[model samples]
Target: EKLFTPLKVGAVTAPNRVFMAPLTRLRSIEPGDIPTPLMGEYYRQRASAGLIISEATQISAQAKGYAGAPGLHSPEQIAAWKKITAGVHAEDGRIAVQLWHTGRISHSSIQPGGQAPVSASALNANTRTSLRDENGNAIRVDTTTPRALELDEIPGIVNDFRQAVANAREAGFDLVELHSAHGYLLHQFLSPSSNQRTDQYGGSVENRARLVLEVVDAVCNEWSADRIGIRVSPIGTFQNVDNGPNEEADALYLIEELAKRGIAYLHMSETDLAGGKPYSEAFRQKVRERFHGVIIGAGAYTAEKAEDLIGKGLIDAVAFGRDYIANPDLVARLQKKAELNPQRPESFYGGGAEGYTDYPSL
Candidate 1:
């Protein structure tokens, strides 16, 4: 099977093309937002995946949005992840850290010093984020308006990414994936609606793409282009961030630039899972044309769909998020066409082993 064949993704050779997409499980220890031993065991169990792109980890304290999502800023955070990476390596699996800044998709309760979140432009994100109440129960609260990043402060954001890449390197990750998707900080700059600034970081496609490119360059400087991948959602509205009519052009422009940098892969996160418009074949073809590197298609993909897409040459690999949550041996299960374990959506976030590492594997 094509999915079972080995594929070279940058510096690491994946054993199979059944990659594990990054999913925010929000199981980290609070007060420090550190990855736990449970999280390490969780990734270790799924080591059979071709590549494990980790959950969206914050680059800095200011980058945090969700309460329990882990961070890569401090030594303690790096040390915990180092142990996790060693566990995956012992199992002979490759992993990548998905670094991100939540940007406007954050609440002041979780922000540093109880300040407002920072974004490309000051805009109210009409979305809700999960926070723990007094009794340790999860509660959904509306996101507060963000403050536009000062022109000078933008360099600091780039620096944060560079530092995160350095941390990922010390932590022994095979690759680093920038979370430029799902209406995070990077995506906010890329989409026109979220980025309403009249400065260099806004207006034109090149201008909006400047910050991401800078981040990529900084990250590459820390490591190299080959050890990097980026996730992008080309066509969709997320957290009130939309590209409007410029979606295709904006995505293509950024993709073209990324290709020029010789990065490892492009994780194309489609909107189908969110009930948005499905990606047209032509659009996928356009992506293939723009970026010659590995293209990973994600969003509720099945084995059949992955095979079909791989056969069509539209994508080199498929990233499974929800499946990886319930099936620790997802690659093996898919290989045998075995029945997959149903995921308990209720326990998807803010929980312990029940819905996480407790899943039975074949």
Candidate 2:
């Protein structure tokens, strides 16, 4: 398969093999967390990519961790996302909204009326996040106080995801990717180092992964499994999730369950590249063994490296993150084996249209 070749992902057909990784631009409405018309323009410019995995959209106010990120629970936010999706579809592009919840990664200051952030266990992992208070005032990243979620409360969390899926449909997204990676709520429960519960929702790998599976089931009830995807970072060290035993086993089990769902695809990330480690490769095999659906590989992948992975039949597609941040026509450049624009790290996290939407396409 070629990098620019089309591939089938569930019900939709991606025009190219180069997919856009979901990235946080932090350019949503203050307090409301609604996607703006500017965001519509941003996705419109990058519609040339095979597929766009939109920036993670918070499923609820409780999931609000990053400052200025978009949310889907509000009608205004849904309307805003509808515009973005309409623009992409107008350009003949496909887009999927990545659904997310920060769980313990959030602070009470970001919650509704200064409520505490919820999580599986009450053990604060000593991590911090940047968020805002109800007054729309920015707050420093504070050490999160852990709150063990009651089993009765779990249904509401699952309902949040279900509602997000419904909102994504209203927003005109062709697909949805559960943000199970990067030490978020789903990742928190799966990581034994973070989850220390003796209940069925914790303990063994199956118990740990139960929450994510339940969320998947709930979301799939509203959308077809083929129209849904899940992102996972098996060897990711983000938010102190890598420090644990049975890491590989937990990851393998999670992937297998995802495969059983018959999801459209599995997006996996590799944190290390030069170390010659094969965590992604191993993960791809695990997906193939369990999931018969498409697999997209991301994280620090160069043109040659992406081609190598695709050529080996390990991944059905490739996603470029920071590269796409600077190259609006990354797919075209890679197709011609052309030079890529270097990304400016300084402008990565914070900025207006200077670093964003300024990169020219050939």
How well does candidate 2 score on lDDT at residue 199?
85
Clashing pairs in 1: none
Write the residue-wise lDDT of candidate 2 on 73-101 in tens digits. Answer: 99889988989999999999999999999
After superposition of all CA atoms, the RMSD between model 2 and the true structure is: 2.4
Candidate 2: list runs displaced more than 4 Å.
Answer: 132-140, 272-277, 280-283
TM-score for each predicted model, relative to the true structure: 0.98, 0.94
Cα lDDT, all candidates? 0.91, 0.83
Q: In candidate 2, which residue pairs get closer than 3 Å at backbone N, Cα or C atoms, i.e. clash?
A: none
Model 1 lDDT per residue over 62-162, tens place: 99999889999999999999999999999999999999999999999999899999999888888888788786656789998999999999999999999
Worst 10 residues of 2 by lDDT: 272-281
Note each model's CA RMSD in angstroms: 1.0, 2.4
By how many angstroms RMSD does model 1 differ from the true structure?
1.0
